[PDB]
Amino acid sequence: MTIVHRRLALAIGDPHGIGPEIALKALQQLSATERSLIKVYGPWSALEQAAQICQMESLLQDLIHEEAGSLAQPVQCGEITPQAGLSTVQSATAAIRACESGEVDAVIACPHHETAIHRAGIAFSGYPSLLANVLGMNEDEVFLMLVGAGLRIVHVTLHESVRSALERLSPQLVINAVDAAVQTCTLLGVPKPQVAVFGINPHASEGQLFGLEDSQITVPAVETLRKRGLTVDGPMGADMVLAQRKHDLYVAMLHDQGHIPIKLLAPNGASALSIGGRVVLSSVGHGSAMDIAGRGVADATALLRTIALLGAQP
Amino acid sequence: MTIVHRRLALAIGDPHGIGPEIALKALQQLSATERSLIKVYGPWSALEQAAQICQMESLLQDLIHEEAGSLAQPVQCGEITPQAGLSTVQSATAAIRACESGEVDAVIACPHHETAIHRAGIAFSGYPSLLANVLGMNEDEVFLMLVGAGLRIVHVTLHESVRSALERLSPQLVINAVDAAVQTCTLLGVPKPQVAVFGINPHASEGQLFGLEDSQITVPAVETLRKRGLTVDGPMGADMVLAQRKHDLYVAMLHDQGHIPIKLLAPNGASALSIGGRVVLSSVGHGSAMDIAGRGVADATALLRTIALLGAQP
Ligand SMILES: [Zn+2]
Numbered sequence: 259m260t261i262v263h264r265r266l267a268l269a270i271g272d273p274h275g276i277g278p279e280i281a282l283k284a285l286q287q288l289s290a291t292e293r294s295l296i297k298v299y300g301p302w303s304a305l306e307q308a309a310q311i312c313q314m315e316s317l318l319q320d321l322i323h324e325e326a327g328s329l330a331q332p333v334q335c336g337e338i339t340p341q342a343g344l345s346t347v348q349s350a351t352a353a354i355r356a357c358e359s360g361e362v363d364a365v366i367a368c369p370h371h372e373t374a375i376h377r378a379g380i381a382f383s384g385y386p387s388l389l390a391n392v393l394g395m396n397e398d399e400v401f402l403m404l405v406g407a408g409l410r411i412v413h414v415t416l417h418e419s420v421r422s423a424l425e426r427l428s429p430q431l432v433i434n435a436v437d438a439a440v441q442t443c444t445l446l447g448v449p450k451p452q453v454a455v456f457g458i459n460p461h462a463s464e465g466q467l468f469g470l471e472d473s474q475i476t477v478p479a480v481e482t483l484r485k486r487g488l489t490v491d492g493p494m495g496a497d498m499v500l501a502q503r504k505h506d507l508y509v510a511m512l513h514d515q516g517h518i519p520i521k522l523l524a525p526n527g528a529s530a531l532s533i534g535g536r537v538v539l540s541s542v543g544h545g546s547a548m549d550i551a552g553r554g555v556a557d558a559t560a561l562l563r564t565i566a567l568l569g570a571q572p
Numbered sequence: 573m574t575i576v577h578r579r580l581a582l583a584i585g586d587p588h589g590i591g592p593e594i595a596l597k598a599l600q601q602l603s604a605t606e607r608s609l610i611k612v613y614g615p616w617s618a619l620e621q622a623a624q625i626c627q628m629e630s631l632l633q634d635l636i637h638e639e640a641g642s643l644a645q646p647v648q649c650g651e652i653t654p655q656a657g658l659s660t661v662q663s664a665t666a667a668i669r670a671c672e673s674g675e676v677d678a679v680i681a682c683p684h685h686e687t688a689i690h691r692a693g694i695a696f697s698g699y700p701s702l703l704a705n706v707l708g709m710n711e712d713e714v715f716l717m718l719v720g721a722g723l724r725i726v727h728v729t730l731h732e733s734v735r736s737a738l739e740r741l742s743p744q745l746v747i748n749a750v751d752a753a754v755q756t757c758t759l760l761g762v763p764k765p766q767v768a769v770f771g772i773n774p775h776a777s778e779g780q781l782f783g784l785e786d787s788q789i790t791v792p793a794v795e796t797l798r799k800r801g802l803t804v805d806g807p808m809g810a811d812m813v814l815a816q817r818k819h820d821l822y823v824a825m826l827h828d829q830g831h832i833p834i835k836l837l838a839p840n841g842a843s844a845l846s847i848g849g850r851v852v853l854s855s856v857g858h859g860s861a862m863d864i865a866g867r868g869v870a871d872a873t874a875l876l877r878t879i880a881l882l883g884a885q886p
């Protein structure tokens with residue numbers, strides 16, 4: 259069975275962590291044709307290290323690879339070092355620019371170590387931020403879609419105060435989020451999605467009974483998106499819509515509106531997609547596991563699940 | 573098996589709806605002893621009507637009943653009339669005063685018709701409002717607790733604009749919600765509950781990084797509640813806490829924060845408790861169904877679920 263149906267970048271994450279190890283284990287399990295669609299970004303020295311340990315030298319010749327985040331000393335498995343911090347970011351940066359320029363259609367980043375990156379003197383608050391930075395966009399022009407338990411929920415606003423979010427909300431900002439998320443939905447394998455838009459206020463303002471924000475922001479936005487020919491219901495109260503479970507994409511106005519459903523229903527098997535200008539970036543859903551780095555204990559199931567998700571066919 | 577363990581008031585709701593019908597069908601299914609703990613508030617004429625329809629004449633003699641919301645004309649099944657609007661409110665008012673005075677320990681209200689009540693010239697924004705009015709409390713001293721799928725979530729604010737909610741939130745208002753909800757928890761059968769408080773902002777402001785509201789409102793409130801000797805964690809991000817599933821009561825800051833989890837996990841089978849003073853009032857979770865009124869085809873499962881919930885053993 260074939261899980262990779264398009265070109266992808268795989269940044270291998272922290273080269274001292276389990277990222278290199280799981281990168282090889284996942285490519286191992288793909289077919290020859292599948293492997294040629296995955297360009298691996300990271301220091302060759304780290305993939306060599308992981309290949310001797312897991313005894314997968316044969317595979318290195320098949321890998322399509324671009325050097326990024328080279329190290330100036332041998333790989334020290336399990337060790338938190340500024341070097342590996344920088345490697346991680348350079349690798350992820352190489353992968354993202356490859357997506358921007360159109361060489362690949364999406365990016366998967368293997369695990370990072372926050373401390374390592376901070377010790378290099380590099381600001382890192384998460385992939386939403388990094389992606390924005392790298393592409394020259396403001397952080398609010400990149401949207402986060404959570405995916406788990408059949409739910410896809412893009413968020414118009416994210417890591418800010420509720421009040422700050424309400425002040426930023428506009429018809430345009432909603433439109434941008436949905437456009438970004440419908441594009442992302444084609445890649446995920448749902449070309450013509452059914453879309454639901456959450457209300458800002460309870461019961462979507464109930465007309466204007468509970469505030470004017472929905473009549474100013476979400477109602478105008480839904481009518482513009484229909485006129486361009488999208489299938490869009492709402493605004494509706496977030497509680498009531500989610501319960502019906504009959505849409506392929508939900509559009510949350512605030513962080514909590516979209517994160518509560520997801521963390522309740524998909525406590526483990528859930529993906530975070532950061533979406534910019536052509537660029538869909540997902541993490542694997544786990545840490546770098548420095549204490550088992552190079553010990554042959556980590557499997558690639560999380561990485562393979564992520565590849566299946568970003569590599570579905572239209 | 574016995575579901576009623578204490579004295580309860582059952583206001584029969586709109587006498588032209590299915591309220592009378594479901595009241596009888598639910599009492600039917602209880603044992604003789606259970607029936608004597610439920611005092612039925614409403615116009616006798618409407619219970620007579622529903623007794624012929626559902627063919628339960630035998631039952632009327634066993635009912636403990638207080639006349640309330642008497643009608644001045646025959647019962648008209650299916651019809652929206654100011655009179656039935658007034659009946660509903662009088663019945664529910666009789667039931668609530670019975671709770672206030674200590675004759676019963678909680679109240680269940682069968683379905684009303686909003687239009688009917690409005691056409692009588694009666695202000696009605698829900699049971700929170702009615703209960704406050706009847707008890708001589710301000711509307712913001714009555715809180716709504718949703719209960720479904722093992723989750724209990726009180727809400728500090730409810731049917732208002734998000735902005736209006738943020739402006740109303742204070743340490744005191746949180747404290748009041750929790751005290752009302754802990755009292756309610758004793759009645760529900762959890763005397764000494766473990767409590768979780770949601771953050772106003774994502775990640776509970778993450779200190780003060782994502783807004784100052786949590787440091788001003790929820791953090792001071794939690795410290796006061798501990799010092800009086802309650803078991804209270806938070807504020808935490810709503811998503812993250814709910815996922816742990818290790819508390820008996822969650823404290824939501826906004827409507828949507830508490831209604832999304834509930835309607836997703838218990839999309840039909842959730843109860844709405846209005847709590848004020850010692851008075852816990854619950855609706856059945858459905859409408860008055862005027863199109864089947866009188867046809868004897870209404871299901872009492874929602875009412876029985878509500879009775880089981882408020883008629884809790886410990
Ligand atoms: Zn978050």
Ligand SMILES: [Zn+2]
Pocket residue numbers: 831
């Ligand atoms: Zn509601």
